[PDB]
Design a protein around this nucleic acid. Structure first.
Ligand SMILES: [Mg+2]
Lengths: 387, 50, 56, 79, 117, 76, 178, 109
DNA sequence: ACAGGGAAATGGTTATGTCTGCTTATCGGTAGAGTG
RNA sequence: AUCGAGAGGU
DNA sequence: CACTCTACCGATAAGCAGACATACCTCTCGACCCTGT
């Protein structure tokens, strides 16, 4: 069972195999992120085909603290649920918490009740843990204070948090921004804009975080919280007609469809001569040996020797089983296994006796006739889906 | 069924998931489906008669 | 880089017409003709609603 | 499951003790142990509704509506 | 290491590998199986480092040392050391400067056993 | 454990599939009925008898397992 | 030095050797264990595998899909080889160089012996690289030397253990037969 | 028709332009009918073999997705597991790691 | 005529029901404790 | 190659 | 032993925005703007 968790900055730093930070626009198309583009080279892995490219992540040095937008409720409840704890190592009963919606940003508010009187020396733990910025009712709570109060966790708090159903991680403050690989290539434009904003703000930093810096520590948060946050192989579809002069388990197939699609089967000892007399007359298309595939087109002057390790796919002939899929119908009876029949026309022959299990009239309906590939799938379709 | 972002973030903040064998994982992660031919029964080979 | 015919495209070239506009953009079109006779699977219809597929 | 009782994949919960009537009559039905029925009952309940509502039948409209009503009842409801 | 993990002594690999090389004739005579490359190397190593001939007598005479509070690691050390002098055991483990004055007697016992056998 | 002692169709399909896949991997047949064109017929004639080399191991929802040989089980 | 370890392994066995008599199946599975074990070199946590002596328990085999082969999970006990820090080991030297010698300690073939810690032996150039000291002692091929390991280093590309020896000391001499 | 050929550059699936080759998409009705019939082998076959197939790796000790394979904390890639995972789940975990949610793939083998 | 940043607005306001869910006023309903 | 829209057989 | 007076939990509506167009599959026909050197 897969388990979800939060991405802490240390985990992003460990996952990031590159040591250099991404600061320039041209660094997004470098070589250590795989080969999803049409032109370029790789330095990390070097898998030349796109089917082997998995992608490599990255990180951006971001020294500014940003709150997690969609996890403000989790922090709210985790801060409201804890009992009153004085000393975190190893008058505060009426404390309340609220939020302010300032330009879309969800900032936490530590507001005191109006019935209580304000005292400059109260909450000495907040004073020793951080400097009091706002001496009024509006106090901007910086994420550093939250990280500092949440860094040292006692045993009882750990037990109660593991019992309630949550767990705090070092990922609420985004310090290392994970950058997705180039497998995807407006998101790129927003990434470029936010990169320009963060580099401008970093160039506009001088000293510790004060009011003169907090006045410029706003647009970043607003830009963060404003806009920053299957097919199948085998297939066949054609018009179906009526044919009541054949068995119920027999269904027709055109020439080109039977010529294109094949049926995979492993080489056995009981059919040593049959496979040879089928492969010498050039009816098969290709054959796979180990991890490489060899075609059966014109150009081979050497005889195709039989080997149990070399798998072959035989063209569908009388003796193959297939199941069909109809327009959506509640009944599972619509899916059925029928033997294939060879003919010269291009349409499919369906007897009128199969109209009650299905729902397709001969008025122009379309079906989806599939092909089993594995021999286990062959047994499954011949035993379960059979009439 | 509904907007995937809210349920995904809820599962992320929950961080508690048990080992279950429903349709989830069998059709999205490649796990063997636990109904039909892939139900709870094994095929250990016996050496006594062979 | 040239346009290659896809699956259901085949025929005998019946007309090749080439032309340009005032903006200096050369155009060109090739028309391919196929003649067909009713074959199994082709839908027919009358003046009164009934509609069916040739089956034999 | 193999025990003959209807089991659930989550928390190993039991829904029914045996799938199949145990009256005086006896028939060897196609229902076996390792066979899913919840999906089968889902399709077999969605089929009749479809017909009743695809046709414009007003007699079947009342019948379909009652079935629709029983399929929308909720734990919390008001007036 | 598992619960049934014990360090092997000397000349047991000699005997076992001599048995394997005796079987090697029929093993190579059968074209179904190929000969490994590690057996002959290990047997050359054990013939270059063979010192004892009987495991049972040396085991029964060293068992009192196992009772004296000696584990099997240093047992293998003194077995593959052919230990007998005080300088040899000093150069083997330099951390015995404080306990040589009591460990000299097991060294004399080992010398006597090696001289007897 | 099981009083009915009836083989389900799903286990039958599984064992026929694995028997065909085994006989299709350069392995001789237990019965002397070689010469077929498809491995499905070989697997069917093999399961039609009682001599089957492998058996099935059922699982219990309580968290245990019970063995049941194919020799004592009967097939329809 | 040689440690007895019990470890589970999923051995692959085809079905062309399936017969009624069981001793043939036992010989087949044994020779398949041997041919599968004589293909790798060693491991990082366990060490050099030497051989297998006795089988403990036989386990029932499971079938694999898409390939038609049965896998036998068998519990067996085997012999391994591992060298530890500070464990003095006897080795024979084969190749001599300018900066050190290439001594052979059983299967390991990359035990490095640094020359900077060689106070008494001096290098003599010529066809045969040799080291001679005041005690009239030589270290060459077929000659065993007693060294003390000070460290071990692993290599993932060669699958070998790089051990560095030490020769500094007082009155160091070769072993004398009695 | 379709035996093999090009796929989608994003989802690694057969394209919708069925003029040449291509290939239809597996619908929910097909999966519903398959689970109703009680089939698991051919379902996984059509879901992995004929569809987008790939590979995945993680440390036995660590609980993160390892990109051959290398995890940085436990440098010893000697303890890795290779399990068959389709490309859809790979894109999903990639997108979740891009958003900021890590995945703990609990694997027995 | 092309590289680089991320903008460019025009006021306007009479024209799917029907619902689930989330967040605010409104109504009582207490429940004490100043008095008595 | 990509996106969106429109027109279709079920 | 009766009175009044405001702190606290409910029930309330009561207002507030959203949210939604079964599914398999076919074909053709156009797709960001203002400004500086
Ligand atoms: Mg119709």
């Amino acid at each position: 069972g897969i388990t979800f968790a939060l991405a802490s900055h240390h985990e992003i730093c460990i996952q990031s195999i590159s040591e250099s930070a991404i600061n320039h626009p041209s660094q997004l198309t470098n070589a250590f992120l795989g080969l999803p583009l049409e032109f370029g080279k790789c330095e990390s892995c070097g898998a030349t085909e796109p089917d082997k490219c998995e992608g490599h992540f990255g990180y951006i040095q971001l020294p500014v603290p940003i709150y997690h937008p969609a996890h403000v409720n989790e922090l709210k409840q985790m801060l409201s649920l804890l009992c009153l704890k004085c000393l975190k190592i190893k008058e505060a009963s009426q404390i309340s918490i609220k939020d302010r919606a300032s330009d879309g940003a969800s900032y936490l508010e530590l507001k005191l009740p109006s019935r209580s009187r304000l005292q400059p020396g109260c909450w000495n733990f907040l004073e020793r843990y951080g400097y009091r910025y706002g001496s009024d009712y509006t106090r901007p709570l910086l994420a550093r204070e939250v990280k500092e109060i949440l860094r040292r966790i006692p045993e009882e708090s750990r037990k109660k948090l593991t019992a309630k159903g949550h767990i705090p991680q070092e990922g609420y403050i985004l310090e290392y921004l994970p950058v997705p690989p180039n497998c995807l290539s407006p998101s790129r434009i927003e990434l470029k804009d936010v990169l320009k904003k963060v580099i401008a703000i970093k160039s506009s930093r001088s000293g510790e975080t004060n009011f003169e810096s907090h006045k410029a520590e706003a647009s970043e948060m607003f830009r963060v919280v404003d806009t920053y946050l299957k097919g199948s192989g085998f297939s066949s579809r054609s018009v179906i007609t009526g044919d009541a002069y054949r068995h119920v388990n027999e269904v027709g197939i055109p020439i080109e469809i039977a010529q294109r699609i094949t049926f995979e089967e492993r080489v056995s000892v009981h059919n040593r001569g049959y496979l040879q007399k089928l492969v010498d007359d050039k009816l098969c298309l290709s054959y796979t040996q180990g991890s490489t595939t060899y075609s059966l087109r014109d150009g081979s002057k050497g005889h195709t020797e039989l080997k149990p390790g070399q798998v072959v796919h035989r063209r569908v002939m009388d003796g193959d089983v297939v199941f069909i899929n109809r327009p959506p119908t509640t009944h599972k009876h619509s899916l059925q296994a029928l033997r294939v029949y060879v003919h010269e026309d291009n349409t499919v022959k369906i007897n009128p006796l199969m109209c009650s299990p299905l729902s397709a009239d001969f008025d122009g309906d379309c079906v989806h006739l599939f092909y089993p590939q594995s021999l286990s799938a062959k047994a499954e379709v011949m035993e379960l889906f059979s009439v | 069924l509904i907007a995937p972002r809210k349920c995904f973030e809820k599962a992320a903040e929950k961080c508690h998931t048990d080992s279950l064998s429903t349709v989830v994982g069998s059709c999205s992660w490649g796990k063997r489906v636990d109904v039909g031919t892939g139900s709870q029964f094994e095929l250990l080979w016996n050496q006594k008669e062979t | 880089h040239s346009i290659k015919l896809k699956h259901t495209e085949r025929g005998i070239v019946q007309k090749v017409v080439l032309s340009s506009n005032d903006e200096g953009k050369n155009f060109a079109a090739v028309s391919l003709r196929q003649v067909r006779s009713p074959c199994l699977g082709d839908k027919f219809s009358s003046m009164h609603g009934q509609k069916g597929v040739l089956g034999y | 499951t193999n025990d003959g009782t209807v089991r659930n994949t989550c928390s190993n919960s039991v829904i029914q003790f045996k799938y199949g009537v145990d009256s005086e009559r006896g028939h060897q039905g196609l229902f076996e142990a390792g066979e899913p029925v919840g999906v089968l009952a889902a399709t077999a309940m969605s089929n009749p509704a479809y017909k009743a509502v695809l046709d414009s039948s007003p007699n079947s409209n009342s019948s379909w509506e009652l079935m629709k009503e029983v399929l929308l009842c909720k734990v919390n409801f008001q007036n | 290491l598992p619960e049934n993990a014990e360090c092997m002594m000397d000349c047991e690999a000699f005997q076992i590998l001599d048995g394997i090389k005796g079987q090697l004739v029929g093993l190579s005579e059968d074209p179904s199986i190929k000969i490994p490359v590690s057996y002959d190397r290990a047997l050359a190593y054990v013939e270059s480092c063979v010192h004892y001939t009987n495991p049972q007598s040396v085991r029964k005479v060293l068992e009192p040392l196992k009772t004296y509070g000696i584990s099997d690691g240093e047992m293998c050390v003194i077995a593959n050391a052919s230990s007998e002098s005080v300088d040899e055991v000093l150069a083997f483990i330099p951390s015995l400067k404080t306990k040589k004055e009591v460990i000299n007697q097991p060294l004399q016992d080992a010398l006597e056993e090696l001289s007897k056998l | 454990r099981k009083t009915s002692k009836f083989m389900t169709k799903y286990e039958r399909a599984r064992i026929l599939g694995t028997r065909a896949l085994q006989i299709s991997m350069n392995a001789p047949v237990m019965v002397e009925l070689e010469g077929e064109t498809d491995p499905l017929e070989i697997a069917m004639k093999e399961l039609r008898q009682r001599k089957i080399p492998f058996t099935i191991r059922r699982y219990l929802p309580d968290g245990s397992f019970e063995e049941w040989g194919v020799d004592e089980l009967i097939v329809e | 030095m040689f440690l007895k370890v019990q470890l589970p392994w999923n051995v692959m066995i085809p079905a062309e050797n399936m017969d009624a008599k069981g001793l043939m199946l036992k010989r087949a599975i044994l020779v398949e264990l041997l041919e599968a074990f004589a293909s790798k070199k060693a491991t990082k946590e366990l060490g050099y595998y030497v051989a297998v002596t006795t089988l403990d328990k036989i386990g029932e085999g499971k079938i694999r899909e898409h390939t038609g082969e049965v896998l036998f999970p068998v519990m067996f006990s085997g012999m391994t080889f591992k060298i530890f820090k500070g464990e003095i080991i006897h080795g024979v030297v084969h190749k001599v160089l300018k900066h050190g010698v290439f001594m052979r300690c059983g299967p390991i073939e990359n035990v490095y012996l640094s020359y900077t810690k060689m106070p008494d032996y001096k290098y003599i150039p010529g066809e045969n690289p040799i080291f001679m000291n005041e005690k009239t002692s030589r270290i060459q091929v077929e000659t065993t030397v007693r060294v003390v390991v000070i460290g071990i280093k692993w290599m993932e590309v060669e699958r070998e253990f790089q051990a560095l020896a030490s020769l500094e000391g007082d009155y160091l001499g070769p072993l004398s037969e009695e | 028709f379709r035996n093999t050929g090009p796929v989608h550059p994003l989802t690694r699936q057969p394209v919708a332009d069925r003029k040449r080759f291509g290939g239809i998409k597996f619908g929910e009705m097909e999966r519903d009918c398959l689970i109703a019939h009680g089939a698991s082998a051919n379902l996984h076959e059509r879901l992995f073999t004929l569809s987008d197939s790939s590979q995945m790796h993680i440390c036995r000790k660590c609980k993160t997705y390892a990109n051959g394979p290398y995890c940085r904390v436990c440098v010893s890639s000697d303890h890795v597991v290779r399990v068959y995972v389709p490309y859809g789940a790979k894109l999903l975990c990639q997108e979740l790691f891009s958003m900021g949610i890590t995945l703990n793939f609990d694997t027995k083998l």
